[PDB]
């Protein structure tokens, strides 16, 4: 959990450098983050590949048009933090984005959400997903005492 | 290739309950390891396994895929 | 640093310090109370000396001193026997041929000590840090080094013996040719049916051996028939000779054979009786307990290479890691104030003309110019102060090429080694002695 | 023969207070070195 | 002293351009090393082409509008550095696309320059809303690797240009995960299991096959030291 | 864009520490260089050490030899540290023999022809007038680190004790990366790596030999495919 707080948390966790940008997907922006130029703490643009559910609330915004859009859908770009976007890119593919910090209660509601909505095998599956990510990140939060 | 190779739900929703799943999977292994136990007489009320088999097996393993498969059925008497 | 910690891990760790095994090489703790010289010298197990004299014989078995006025006197020095709870008592010999010695003085060191100080244990170098889960809920991280160059591992002798007792039918016979065996497991036995000093033995070996004088025999229609196809005669002696428990291994150190018709006496009944060593040296692997001074304490969950384990600016790979989020819950920060005790006893410190209100009270106290290596003491009530530590950081000797791998505020750059890339963030490093 | 056989054979592990029903859950053994049984930190906390 | 299973690489294809590759057991301790540093090479030592910097008719840099289309100039710069690109000029290199007339402007509709191919016609650009009035010229560098936009004062050569962050590796993720194997009845054996994802121009297995060319020369640079042997085979 | 490639040179700190510096890499390559190059430094490298000894008058390594106020066990412990380089694939067997008082070390131990000790200041023992050293040790090479629990290989021998031994060289390495003077942004680093070896071999022949086994991976990787 602790390693997911860290994954998932809002800026001045670090010196935020490279915040204020838009990338193209998932993939140029963890391209960025191993370069150093962006720090995981970050306010930034991400796009997103058709099959990602949006955020719960950000169901009622879309993008501007004369046309019919459904952005439930489809894709669509978005304020959030690469961290959030790792975090929900391990949770199941159906399952709406989560863009606020995760601690311990809110990982439990989702989880309990989880445990609701889905079969049981997609839930141990995500779990462990959770777990390996949760501790790579714990690893690299460099929380220590002195 | 594991534990949880056969996914429940499915198995549930085909007996509708849980403990019922359970002792009707446990009746066909008594069943099928009893077959594969024959080892000559040929009884003609036996029944082997209805799914492919593995050199080495557990007929639980084999019973439980068999009712997710679903063409094995019961009655209650 | 106990003051520091809460009442409660204070008691697990004083409690926990009664179970500490000796060790195959002790060594005194880098950082600890200047009072273990005294609990180590008051205890029996060193062996100290009763006069003023000059050694003149050292040797592993016994030590010759000769006093002035002419007395001669040899200490025999236990070696490998074993305890109450079954460990070693090994004991070492520090003296040098002519050294002067006065009374009271060590001369021979014992289980867990060095050169007559206490030690229970090693000196590690732990860093804090989570490490992808492996040292999970308290559980420890260490190198594969421990293991490799004997850092942490304990002999260990079992004792275990059976007697050759006359019962209502006959004498059991302690003898070579036990019956319904086959050739090859009576293969290392001595003459009269005793295992050989020296043979390493498995689970199911057979120690010492032993038959049953007689038992009414019946044979059944299917032995009968059986040993008329092969001709074998089943006698009326049967086997009930002593065997290894199983899941157990060893080399046998030495045995004990008491005779009834020896001038040596033994209870009722009991004819004979034997007794043999099985010495073992076990390593510091998966499952086993280890633990700090604090009451920090956890079960080994994995024994990670060498090269994975996260090193130091100067390549010098941390031999053990730790969860941190232990101490802030379990209330003994004692432990990180050690952990940079210790890193300032290994990389000695110079302090002079500082003009500093912590370098004062260091000269004033003599500890200004301490070498590297040396052992530091901090009472368990008027230990080092957090001025003082800070000052030191600041003005620790440079290690290599000029420049201290610690940071002044305690922490240091770790680079993992499985990814290699240098960790985001300063680590907590240091110097803790783990039993 | 041991790898081959102890798969899919279910074995429950088991706490020593077993506060609460889960304290007896059944896993899938599977062999590994050392000693000391090897068990997922998920499911720790549910045995307390 | 020779190793006692010798690795073959393996693939696994699950779709045209995202792939699997499993080397078989390995010595104790090695599956991190070569993992490790096939997924850093791999994404950056080769190399490719990508823009470098966009130009649209008629806006200045402040001016992040463009009259004539009902999408913004943000999400245009997200699509153009997605867009994939071949070159080989070694220099930069400008390609013109001039469109009006409401519609849909696509990389189909994108007419390139000699020696520069688009490999992907089917991305949609731009939606146009009336009279579509747009006017674009895009310039192509090839590169290596990865790097941050930057400006180089083409802004002020030049009001309409602006920078945009590059994609030159051709590999947009390497996902590597190492996992343990049984072999002899010893556990001591190590397997990777490396995940490419790869854009549709390059089949991300000859994309590996350079990369560990690209290591084969790096670490065979320290044979020049002295010629030794070691166990393998 | 700018095609540069690696370029390898070396310097020399001590008789046995030297520095490599290879400036050309891409940048956030260093470190992935330095670490794999590291690992497998360590982990890999053929080298001489001593498997199994055998001592007269003695069955295990718990007891004492009389004569020398270290018991077997220390004696093991100082040996299993002693440094060799054997250059015979197969075992080779060596003797060690000492009468009178003194302190016997590496330096004495007799070595057969292309089997070489290169720690003679190392002390073993001490023996006293009446004491009496005589062992038989067996040198092997290999790579990594094999215990003596796998080590024993002969039963009936029961004079024969087996040692833990730890074949690899080299004592530690430390990488560290920089920026390139060369005006770009992508800002090349140049890796710098410092391997300090025991006095078995020069550093450079053992991170020739770590190239060796990682250009082998690697050429593997590669040719395997297209």
């Known amino acids: 959990v602790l390693g997911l707080f860290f994954l998932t948390t809002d800026s001045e966790g670090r010196s935020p450098k490279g915040e204020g940008r838009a990338f193209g997907s998932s993939a140029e922006a963890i391209m960025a983050f191993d370069a150093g130029d962006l720090t995981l703490q970050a306010k930034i643009d991400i796009r997103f590949p058709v099959g990602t559910i949006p955020p719960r609330g950000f169901e009622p915004p879309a993008r501007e048009e004369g046309e019919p859009e459904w952005q439930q859908g489809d894709t669509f770009t978005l304020k959030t933090t690469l961290g959030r976007a790792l975090f929900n890119e391990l949770l199941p593919e159906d399952y709406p984005f989560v863009d606020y910090e995760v601690g311990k209660k809110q990982l439990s509601e989702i989880v309990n959400d989880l445990a609701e909505r889905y079969p049981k095998v997609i839930v141990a599956a995500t779990l462990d997903n959770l777990k390996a990510a949760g501790f790579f990140w714990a690893t690299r939060s460099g929380v220590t005492v002195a | 290739e594991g534990i949880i190779n056969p996914p429940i739900d499915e198995l549930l929703e085909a007996t509708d309950s849980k403990y019922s799943l359970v002792i009707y999977a446990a009746k066909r292994a008594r069943q099928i390891n009893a077959y594969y136990s024959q080892l000559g007489e040929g009884l003609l009320e036996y029944v082997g396994p209805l799914v492919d088999t593995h050199v080495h097996e557990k007929p639980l393993s084999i019973a439980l895929r068999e009712i997710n498969a679903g063409l094995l059925t019961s009655e209650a008497i | 640093f106990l003051e520091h910690d809460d009442a409660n891990r204070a008691l697990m760790g004083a409690n926990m310090m009664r179970q500490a095994v000796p060790l195959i090489k002790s060594e005194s703790p880098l950082v600890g109370t200047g009072m273990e010289y005294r609990s180590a010298a008051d205890a029996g197990d060193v062996v100290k000396a009763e006069k003023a004299g000059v050694v003149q014989e050292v040797s592993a078995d016994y030590i010759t001193t000769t006093n002035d006025d002419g007395t001669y006197i040899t200490y025999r020095l236990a070696k490998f026997s074993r305890s109450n709870q079954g460990t070693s008592v090994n004991q070492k010999v ?7 010695i006065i009374e009271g003085q060590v001369l021979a ?3 867990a000590t060095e050169n007559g100080e206490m030690a229970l244990g090693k000196n590690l170098l732990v860093a804090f840090m989570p490490w992808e889960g492996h040292n999970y809920e308290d559980a420890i991280i260490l190198s594969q080094r421990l293991v490799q160059d004997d850092v942490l591992s304990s002999i260990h002798i079992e004792e275990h013996e059976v007697d050759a007792r006359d019962t209502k039918l006959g004498p059991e016979e302690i003898t070579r040719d036990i019956p319904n065996v086959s050739e090859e497991v009576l293969a290392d036995l ?8 020296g043979a390493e033995v498995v689970a199911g070996d057979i120690l010492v051996g032993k038959v049953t004088p007689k038992g009414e025999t019946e044979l059944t229609p299917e032995e009968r028939l059986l040993r008329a196809i092969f001709g074998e005669k089943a006698r009326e002696v049967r086997d009930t000779s002593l065997k290894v428990p199983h899941g157990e291994i060893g080399k046998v150190i030495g045995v004990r054979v008491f005779d009834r018709e020896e001038g040596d006496e033994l209870p009722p009944g009991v004819n004979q009786l034997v007794r043999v060593y099985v010495a073992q040296k076990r390593k510091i692997t998966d499952g086993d307990k280890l633990a700090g001074r604090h009451g920090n304490k956890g079960v080994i969950s994995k024994i990670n290479p060498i090269e994975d384990m996260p090193f130091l600016e100067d390549g010098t790979p941390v031999d053990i890691i730790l969860n941190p989020l232990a101490v802030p819950s379990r209330m003994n920060p004692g432990q990180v104030l050690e952990i940079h005790l210790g890193w300032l006893a290994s990389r000695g410190w110079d302090v002079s003309g500082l003009a500093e209100e912590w370098a004062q009270r260091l000269q004033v106290i003599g500890a200004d110019k301490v070498e590297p290596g040396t052992n530091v003491a901090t009472p368990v009530f008027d230990g080092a102060r957090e001025d003082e ?9 440079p290690n290599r090429d000029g420049e201290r791998m610690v940071l002044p505020s305690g922490k240091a750059r770790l680079f993992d080694g499985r990814s290699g890339e240098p960790f985001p963030e300063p680590i907590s490093v240091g110097y803790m002695y783990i039993l | 023969v041991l790898e081959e056989v102890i798969a899919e054979h279910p074995v429950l592990l088991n706490r020593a207070p077993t506060l609460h029903r889960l304290g007896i859950q059944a896993f899938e053994p599977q062999l590994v070195e050392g000693k000391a049984i090897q068990i997922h930190p998920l499911v720790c906390t549910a045995f307390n | 002293m020779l190793i006692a299973q010798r690795p073959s690489l393996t693939e696994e294809v699950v779709d045209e351009f995202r792939s699997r590759f499993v080397i078989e057991p390995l010595e ?19 190399p490719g082409a990508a823009v470098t910097s966009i130009r649209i008719d008629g806006v200045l840099h402040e001016f992040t509008t463009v009259p004539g289309v009902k999408e913004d100039v943000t999400d245009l710069i997200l699509n153009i550095k997605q867009l994939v690109v071949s070159s080989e000029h070694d220099e930069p290199v400008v390609m013109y696309l001039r469109k009006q007339g409401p519609g849909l402007v696509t990389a189909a509709d994108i007419a390139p320059p000699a020696g520069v191919e688009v490999h992907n016609p089917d991305l949609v650009l731009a939606t146009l809303n009336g009279k579509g009035k747009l006017e674009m010229e895009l310039t192509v560098e090839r590169g290596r690797g990865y790097v941050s936009a930057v400006q180089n004062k083409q802004v002020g050569q030049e009001i309409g240009r602006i920078p945009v962050d590059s994609i030159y590796s051709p590999v947009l993720k390497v996902t590597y995960k190492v996992e343990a194997t049984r072999v002899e009845q010893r556990t001591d054996f190590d397997k990777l299991i490396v995940d490419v994802e790869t854009k549709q121009a390059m089949r991300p297995r000859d994309a590996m096959a350079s990369a560990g060319k690209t290591l084969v020369e790096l670490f065979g640079l320290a044979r020049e030291l002295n010629i030794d042997a070691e166990g393998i085979d």
């Open chain 3, 94 to 100: 520090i003296v040098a041929e002519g050294d002067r």
């Open chain 3, 190 to 197: 001595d003459e009269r049916g005793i295992i050989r000093i």
């Open chain 3, 389 to 397: 530590l800070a000052g030191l950081l600041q003005h620790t000797i």
């Open chain 5, 28 to 46: 104790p301790g090695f599956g991190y090393t070569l993992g490790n540093s096939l997924r850093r090479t791999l994404l950056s030592s080769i």
């Open chain 3, 109 to 111: 060191d014992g289980p």
